[PDB]
Write a protein that binds this ligand. Structure first.
Ligand code: NA
Ligand code: NA
Lengths: 77, 411, 411, 77
């Protein structure tokens, strides 16, 4: 359905926010009320959704919605 | 001496999602046992349980937070919120350090234990959810409830298998009477109707296998009984020091006057016979309350519908009551709800309290033909109306484990 | 008022399989952390833990009965037998109803939970062992110990995660002081160093990942700490009413004079800051013992070597002790043993007692560079000799959960 | 190693008795100190040892050492 809609949807379900609030510049902790374990569970959901392994050193750099969009985009090749 | 009263009730049970709806269904003799359908029971010897129907906690627990909770945690939170709302207690910064909890469970979060271990064996430890531990351990019902209401007083979690319900309630009263708290929310919660649960208790040959008629499987003291029936749910009580409850004009259901404990000192595979452990816990509760056994009007038995345990319980009632054994009313609400395990003592304490309020006793349904030596008034089939009843006794027995007895007094 | 004394000690720890061997190793600053080898840790971020080495219980538990017990149950039984043998208590038919137990655990039988669920997913419910439930639930340590010694008094099992140790010991003293028992064996046991355990706590990012140097990973209040280290073992104490112990000429290690409880009312993902919950539990223990904080000579801290929790604990000690904060000795034996979770409070109560007997304080090893604001005398590197110490304080803090504090008095 | 030695060994390990005491006429409960859950675990061990499924209606009839010997013998065909 495009990966951005899929990524934004995953973030929406994980953090319990409407898709209206899942903006590209949104910070998981600062804007969407996620704690440190919420972001861990969120990265796991991205892995299971796209059948890709995200190294935890790269997972820590996924702080915003745009970051998760960029990672799943540039790792399907 | 600081007295302890009950000022709030909350409950989720196989026959109702509130206290009053459950109490009405039990007095009507309604069964809450049905066939399991949330997992394939084709390979399971037991295919039925006492399930919580139509459970919707979205107004209390968001979907995001539900995923961090096993079903037994969701049950205990909902029942805890009901009890807190029923108490009308106003928590402030001043009294927060004087309010705590005593909430336990017997088996805990089997469902999310199964799920996290399945992910582990399929994808290694990187598939385990970070919320695995806090979603499964038995103490997280009190953990969430203390956070939701800002409770800072003493909080414990007693996990003593089928006697966790009365132990948590009884030691909540001990914490209040000792002076460490003025209010405590106590009880238990359980959701063992899972593959590991039904399979685990079925492996021990403890469960009834009457899949052809689940509503008649739980038959305490009946000659055709063949094991207990699993039941899910949660029971919560708000215990409060008497003068504290009176000053704030609280509603007062009953007074907790006695709490007794004992140990059996033998395995469940050994004969219980006379149930000396059960009698010892009841005697300690009577001594703690300072009343004679003949003053007890109703006894909410353990009565799990197991062949040896039911007979040993009837002998323990005969030992304690003696001359008054023929007059006291005994009944097992597990004939309708099933065995709620760690929450059994909690929901059955609520029944013993409501029995005082309404002067009515719920029945032991499915008691078609009592066993030899089970000649007590077990209130079979239909509920009993009583008058002038001042004391009720709530029992949780291990018959191979610990025992707990609570005595409640009207007003 | 009934006073409660300690008349028996038993312990299994990563640095010794007896009380005295552990106490000698801790005073020598010996680490008990090593690499895990009983399962493949290649895919695990944390590959080390505080393990019980050279464990042999065949003289106490036959191989047939061991298969019905998770490793944490075997540990608690062995430690319980040691404590019972150390007490020299002679159980008869007369005093059996006055002897009980208060033994808990934080996570319980993960090992046999994993094994039974693996059989389930591979062969259905008919592969689940009939002993699955009694081999995994946390209350079976007390269940076996009561049966082994014929104990019939009150028995409970408090499971409050990292604070189970002090809660079980503290409420065992409450049960004795209330009058429901004269002797209680209390403590906890843990064996979480399993795939689900290391993976579960590792999924929550709670564990240190210093696989290149495991003996330096647990460094409470050090600037390079990165999480706690798992530790297995069990600690058991025989608590006894004072006049009961004196009449039988019992050995008396110390008197349990204070027990305090509190709740944090916030999740572990939220900042603890000043640790108001930890301070509240310590203040309740001082009020319960009726002593000032300046009379405490040594504080066995929680000190799990976590970044936020360690700093919040130092602030709570500053709040309680105030002027005397610069003089009191604080130390985390978790720097050597690791975090024994549900058993941490139990083994650390034994350390606080032996600190009174020998007038020596074990160190906080690996404390190379304390953090800003961690300017307390944490007894770094080597043990401290003291004199005239009358009171010690044993703390278990949740920093997102419950808290427990015990105060012991010499003789 | 012959199924009788294999069966007798399984019974020996399960009930914690020396092979001297695992006689053909030995009753699990009456002679070898097994409770009702010990016999259940024992039948499970026989199943896993010989890769055979024993119906629980037939498992209840396995009360002695000779009974377990007979069942594993006449069900390898
Ligand atoms: Na009952
Ligand atoms: Na400590």
């Amino acid at each position: 359905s495009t990966i951005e809609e899929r990524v934004k949807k995953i973030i929406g379900e994980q953090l319990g926010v409407k898709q209206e609030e899942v903006t590209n510049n949104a910070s998981f902790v600062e804007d969407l009320g996620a704690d440190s374990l919420d972001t861990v569970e969120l990265v796991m959901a991205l892995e299971e959704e796209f059948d890709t392994e995200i190294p935890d050193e790269e997972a820590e750099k996924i702080t915003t919605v745009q970051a998760a969009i960029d990672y799943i985009n540039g790792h399907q090749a | 001496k600081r007295r302890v009263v009950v000022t709030g009730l909350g409950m989720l049970s196989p026959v109702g999602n509130t206290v009053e709806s459950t109490w009405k269904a039990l007095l009507a003799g309604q069964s809450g046992i049905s066939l399991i359908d949330h997992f394939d029971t084709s390979a399971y010897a037991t295919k039925f349980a006492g399930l919580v129907k139509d459970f919707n906690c979205e107004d209390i627990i968001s979907r995001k937070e539900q995923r961090k909770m096993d079903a037994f945690i969701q049950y205990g939170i909902v029942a805890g919120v009901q009890a807190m709302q029923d108490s009308g207690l106003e928590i402030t910064e001043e009294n927060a350090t004087r309010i705590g909890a005593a909430i336990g469970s017997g088996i805990g979060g089997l469902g999310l234990i199964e799920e996290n271990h399945t992910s582990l064996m399929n994808g290694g430890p990187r598939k385990i959810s970070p919320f695995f531990v806090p979603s499964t351990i038995v103490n997280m019902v009190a953990g969430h409830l203390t956070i939701m209401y800002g409770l800072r007083g003493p909080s414990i979690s007693i996990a003593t298998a089928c006697t966790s319900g009365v132990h948590n309630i009884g030691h909540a009263a001990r914490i209040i009477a000792y002076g460490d708290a003025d209010v405590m929310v106590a009880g238990g919660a359980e959701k063992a109707s899972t593959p590991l649960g039904v399979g685990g208790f079925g492996a021990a040959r403890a469960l009834s296998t009457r899949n052809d008629n689940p509503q008649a499987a739980s038959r305490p003291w009946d000659k055709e009984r063949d094991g207990f029936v699993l039941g899910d749910g949660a029971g919560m009580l708000v215990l409060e020091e008497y003068e504290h409850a009176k000053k704030r004009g609280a509603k007062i259901y009953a007074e907790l006057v006695g709490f007794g404990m004992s140990s059996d000192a033998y395995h469940m595979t050994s004969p219980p016979e006379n149930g000396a452990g059960a009698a010892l816990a009841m005697a300690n509760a009577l001594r703690d309350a300072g009343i004679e056994a003949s003053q007890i009007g109703y006894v909410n038995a353990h009565g799990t519908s197991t062949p040896a345990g039911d007979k040993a319980e009837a002998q323990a009632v005969k030992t304690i009551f003696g001359e008054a054994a023929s007059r006291v009313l005994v009944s097992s609400t597990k004939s309708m709800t099933g065995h709620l395990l760690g929450a059994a003592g909690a929901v059955e304490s609520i029944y013993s309290i409501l029995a005082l309020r309404d002067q009515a006793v719920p029945p032991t349904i499915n008691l078609d033909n009592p066993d030899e030596g089970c000649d007590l008034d077990f209130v079979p089939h239909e509920a009993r109306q009583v008058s002038g009843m001042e004391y009720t006794l709530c029992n949780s027995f291990g018959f191979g484990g610990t025992n707990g007895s609570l005595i409640f007094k009207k007003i």
